[model samples]
Target: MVDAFLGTWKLVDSKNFDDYMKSLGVGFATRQVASMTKPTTIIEKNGDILTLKTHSTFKNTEISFKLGVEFDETTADDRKVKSIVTLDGGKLVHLQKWDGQETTLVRELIDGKLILTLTHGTAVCTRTYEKE
Candidate 1:
């Protein structure tokens, strides 16, 4: 669980099983309907505080937090509203409170890889993150 919070992880590559950005409410401008982008993530933790970074040629952002605690996350792009993530069952689950309902993004660490699964309404998107 917390053991997964250590070290530097990279996105060796990724393929979307479903429309990834659709769950994030991304607009038409930055939507990559058929584009391939490998975004790497680096996670580091000291005691209860954690730092996570998502990097890509298109954009880059980092998030800091304490385990079991919450913090607001503003989308780097134009997408409005902030997200809050907490550690649940060894997985990092983010809750983006938008409009009325909440969109959930969960990340699981397995063998040097980060697996992401996002859900909103009836759509679900899955993406994998690898560590270099």
Candidate 2:
């Protein structure tokens, strides 16, 4: 069930996350705090709806949606955004928008690891998570 992505994953690696946050206009104070925390993500399903939730020392966040349904979301940083996460095969492509700007998050599984790539303009951050 690797492709199902129905389990818990803990962050194991992060590269250039600060730069990526900066590109998203996150303030320095928040960026520093974010960088220091390691988060665990849980993906579970029920009632034909999937919920992806995360736990961190700094904050807890969750999202639930069907593949084709887009919902309004507020970021952990409190930015107002319209969010849509679609799946192509087993991979996920998340599009979040606010104020004429968009952030792309590409999530996929490889070698029992879940990878989250955040891209905004010239900044690209890669975060890898290991299923626990």
Candidate 3:
């Protein structure tokens, strides 16, 4: 069976939310707010389809997609344009498709550790996640 991810989770801590947004090419004001923001993750999974919601007092972002099926993503976090997210090797990988450049992001869990890799603007930011 697939390891289920279907619930709400709070952000207890972030290694560096600034770095994560910086890698995404976020601006000074946005990065600052993003750093201080405590993002809450809410995931609803139904079979192969999934809905991910990231909420905070500063901002809220969401993505809806299906496993093995490519879909578009836009972020309230950065107001980024459309992107594509897919499942690769049991991990969720996102590609910023609108831009000419290749912006890739990967999200996975290792040994009960939730790991998120955000690749964009020639930078990579890794974040470790924990349950609340």
Candidate 4:
């Protein structure tokens, strides 16, 4: 299910990412820096385990987990949450929860382009990436 996303992906464009960060309770200083950085996501799979690495000039974040298994996650914006990623309908569905709030991320490949949609509260952000 995640085979289609096992590769390095470069960011192309993003929509409403700043708003999404804001909804996540990110302060203005970090959001200002984050909004200007373009990140590359590298995905690797080894059997049932997966590694997701996001690299950028500002910060680099990595997480390793098996599908459907819950684990602690420290987001790039410095939020601590419980996170899980699952396969659903040929797409990768990621869920994160903290302080009674939840965020959902959906990743899919559309015509060879990787599209990621993140929803946090009323703010939804979409980012498009191409294989590197």
The numbered model that scores best in lDDT is: 4
Model 3: per-residue lDDT, tens digit, 1-132? Answer: 234445666655566557667765678998877667767777787776678888889887778776656566666654545566666787867776556656666778677656777766656666666655
Candidate 3 backbone overlaps, count: 0
TM-score-best of 3 and 4: 4
| Model 4 agreement with the true structure over 51-132: per-residue lDDT tens digits | 9999999899999999999999999988899999999999999999999999998998999999999999899999999999
lDDT to native, each model: 0.69, 0.87, 0.67, 0.93
Candidate 4: worst-modelled 10 consecutive residues by lDDT = 29-38
Q: Which residue pairs collide in model 3, if any?
A: none
Q: TM-scores of all models?
A: 0.78, 0.93, 0.78, 0.97
Against the true structure, candidate 2 has what lDDT?
0.87
**Candidate 1 C-alpha lDDT tens digits along 68-93:** 55567766554455567687888888
Model 4 clash tally, residue pairs: 0
lDDT of 4: 0.93
Model 1, residue pairs in steric clash? none
lDDT of candidate 3? Answer: 0.67
Per-residue CA lDDT of model 2 for 30-112, tens digit only, reads: 89999988899998888657888989988888999876788888788888899988887678888998999989888898887
